[PDB]
Amino acid sequence: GSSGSSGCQECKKTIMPGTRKMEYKGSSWHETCFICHRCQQPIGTKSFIPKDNQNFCVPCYEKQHASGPSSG
Ligand SMILES: [Zn+2]
Ligand SMILES: [Zn+2]
């Protein structure tokens, strides 16, 4: 609301100051809402490759930019 000048992007909800959030480019994402785009899992705080407008883990991202001309 007022006290908390923060907000989520996924569920566009008010991220309380108590829970953990992922601040990326001014925007924020609930510790969960920040799940992966491939495995759809809550990466959280670990080795992960943040995509321009998405998020992919190490094993997931690699697949996106790995030997594989087939996509669609
Ligand atoms: Zn959210
Ligand atoms: Zn993943």
Curated annotation (Swiss-Prot):
Keywords: Cytoplasm, Isopeptide bond, LIM domain, Metal-binding, Nucleus, Phosphoprotein, Repeat, Transcription, Transcription regulation, Ubl conjugation, Zinc, Zinc-finger. Expressed in skeletal muscle and heart. GO terms for molecular function: bHLH transcription factor binding; identical protein binding; transcription corepressor activity; transcription factor binding; zinc ion binding. It comes from the Eukaryota. GO terms for biological process: atrial cardiac muscle cell development; heart trabecula formation; negative regulation of apoptotic process; negative regulation of calcineurin-NFAT signaling cascade; negative regulation of transcription by RNA polymerase II; osteoblast differentiation; response to hormone; ventricular cardiac muscle cell development. Residues 8-60 form the LIM zinc-binding domain. It is found in: Cytoplasm; Nucleus; Cytoplasm, Myofibril, Sarcomere, Z line. GO terms for cellular component: focal adhesion; nucleoplasm; nucleus; Z disc. Interacts with ZNF638 and TTN/titin. Interacts with E4F1. Interacts with GRB7. Interacts with SIRT1 and FOXO1. Interacts with CEFIP. Interacts with calcineurin. Interacts with FOXK1. The third LIM zinc-binding mediates interaction with E4F1. May function as a molecular transmitter linking various signaling pathways to transcriptional regulation. Negatively regulates the transcriptional repressor E4F1 and may function in cell growth. Inhibits the transcriptional activity of FOXO1 and its apoptotic function by enhancing the interaction of FOXO1 with SIRT1 and FOXO1 deacetylation. Negatively regulates the calcineurin/NFAT signaling pathway in cardiomyocytes. This is Four and a half LIM domains protein 2. The gene is FHL2.
